[PDB]
Design a protein around this ligand. Structure first.
Ligand SMILES: [Ca+2]
Ligand SMILES: [Ca+2]
Ligand SMILES: [Ca+2]
Ligand SMILES: [Ca+2]
Ligand SMILES: [Ca+2]
Ligand SMILES: [Ca+2]
Ligand SMILES: [Ca+2]
Ligand SMILES: [Ca+2]
Ligand SMILES: [Zn+2]
Length: 470
């Protein structure tokens, strides 16, 4: 009968489900693509210049008011005044460049620094009198006089935009408004709308800050919890949306990249500096052997390397995701009791201290449970074919367990394992080998009864029959 260990894997594999025919939060559930289509509903976009291979947009920081500032009412009907104008401070400029970069990392856009003034295709400036919210931008389908502008509220009472920094609202607002200048709309409001909306007014359930920085709804609405932090860079649905517009950037991080601790992506939102770090990011990577290093956290974590899946990293829930079309290969857990689930390719999963549950999935994985009593789960024989078997690089009999309880053959077929020394031609025969010389163990099982192993598991440590769970 299925074990608790296998149950935890199955549960997390289906956590944060999207696209179900069901009504989630009284709203239809959209897939990543349906969501992208919704975010792009206005059909606004920049046109790539003649002879340019990539869309090239320059940006500049306004030094004095422009036409729209002086005469807002000539463009936006109900804006009589914007208060006092002020230029972007040094911090706002540095942070604005990091947000711009986070967009160019995922699409084919090359941002050029036009400096101080009104010469850039995208301009940034501050205003002091709110017209409703804390900032605003114009999509690229407006007359040339307005195209590319984004404005941010700064005054004695509202200070969120004064010091943008990794993880805070000020930084997300920059990323959000720039999104607008690039062509992205809020995930909702167009068919109708009002003055005081709530998440109840969302078009689809995944319109929350866990899937799109363009949303205004808390991630809690969908089950995630970033504990006060805000994503500084584009999230799962934003990447998909911006990519339909300007294509996927296939030149980004093509080397062997590490995300989290010991990061080599010179990006603040992909790096963890201490155990107290609150990470919130969606991985976009175009190539190489990559690792999600979450070694520094002591909390119980759940990591899923499948694309489009979210993980509960460092104390937060559903804070780490992997974009569509991305293959991350390895993951390293921390000292807490973790759940690491791999994807279709060969993965290196390291549970570290604590009692972990490792699920390699398809491909020949290298599973390391590390200190503690770890469980290595399997739910399909093809996950460790005899042709391309897994390798348990640090098995410890009487401590670690190999979990086979969720296989169909056992849970439905009622197959019983008979430990033989040679395949005779009966289904259910298993040979537990072990060369004391190399200290290399082995487990082969013939499910089809044709005297040939269908499922195999290499080992480096001793595996007794009392270690295998069915
Ligand atoms: Ca890479
Ligand atoms: Ca990769
Ligand atoms: Ca661990
Ligand atoms: Ca795998
Ligand atoms: Ca462990
Ligand atoms: Ca162990
Ligand atoms: Ca496998
Ligand atoms: Ca066979
Ligand atoms: Zn907005």
């Amino acid at each position: 009968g299925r074990s608790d260990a296998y149950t935890q894997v199955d549960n997390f594999l289906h956590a944060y489900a999207r696209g179900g025919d069901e009504l989630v939060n009284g709203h239809p559930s959209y897939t990543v693509d349906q969501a992208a289509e919704q975010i792009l509903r206005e059909q606004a976009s920049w046109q790539k210049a003649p002879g340019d291979s990539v869309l090239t947009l320059s940006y500049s920081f306004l030094t004095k008011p422009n036409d729209f500032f002086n005469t807002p009412w000539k463009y936006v009907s109900d804006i009589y005044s914007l208060g006092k104008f002020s230029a972007f401070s040094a911090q706002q400029q540095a942070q604005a460049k990091l947000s711009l970069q986070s967009w160019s990392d995922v699409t084919n856009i090359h941002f050029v620094d036009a400096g101080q003034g009104d010469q850039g295709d995208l301009t940034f400036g501050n205003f002091s009198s709110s017209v409703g919210g804390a900032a605003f931008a114009f999509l690229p389908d407006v007359p040339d006089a307005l195209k590319g502008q984004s404005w941010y509220l700064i005054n004695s009472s509202y200070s969120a935009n004064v010091n943008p920094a990794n993880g805070n609202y000020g930084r997300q607002t920059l990323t959000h408004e720039i999104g607008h200048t690039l062509g992205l709309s809020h995930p909702g409001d167009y068919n109708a709308g009002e003055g005081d909306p709530t998440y109840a007014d969302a078009t689809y359930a995944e319109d929350t800050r866990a899937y799109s920085v363009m949303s205004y709804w808390e991630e809690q609405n969908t089950g995630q919890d970033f504990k006060g932090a805000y994503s500084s860079a584009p999230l799962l649905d934003d990447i998909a949306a911006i990519q339909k517009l300007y294509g996927a950037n296939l030149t980004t991080r093509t080397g062997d990249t590490v995300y989290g601790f010991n990061s080599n992506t010179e990006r603040d939102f992909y790096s963890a500096t201490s155990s107290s770090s609150k990470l919130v990011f969606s991985v976009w990577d175009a190539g190489g052997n990559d690792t999600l290093d979450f070694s520094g956290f002591s909390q119980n974590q759940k990591i899923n390397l499948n694309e489009k899946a979210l993980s509960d990293v460092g104390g937060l829930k559903g804070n780490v995701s992997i974009a569509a079309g991305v293959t991350v290969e390895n993951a390293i857990g921390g000292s807490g009791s973790d759940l690491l689930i791999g994807n279709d390719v060969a993965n290196v999963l390291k549970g570290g201290a604590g009692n972990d549950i490792l699920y390699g999935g398809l491909g020949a994985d290298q599973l390391w449970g590390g200190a503690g009593a770890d469980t290595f789960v399997y739910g399909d024989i093809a996950e460790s074919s005899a042709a391309a078997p897994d390798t348990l690089r640090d098995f410890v009999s009487g401590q670690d367990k190999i979990d086979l309880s969720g296989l169909d053959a056992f849970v439905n077929g009622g197959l019983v394992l008979q430990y033989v020394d040679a395949f005779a031609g009966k289904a259910g025969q298993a040979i537990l080998s072990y060369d004391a010389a190399s200290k290399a163990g082995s487990l082969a099982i013939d499910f089809s009864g044709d005297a040939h192993a269908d499922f195999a598991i290499n080992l480096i440590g001793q595996a007794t029959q009392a270690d295998i769970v069915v």
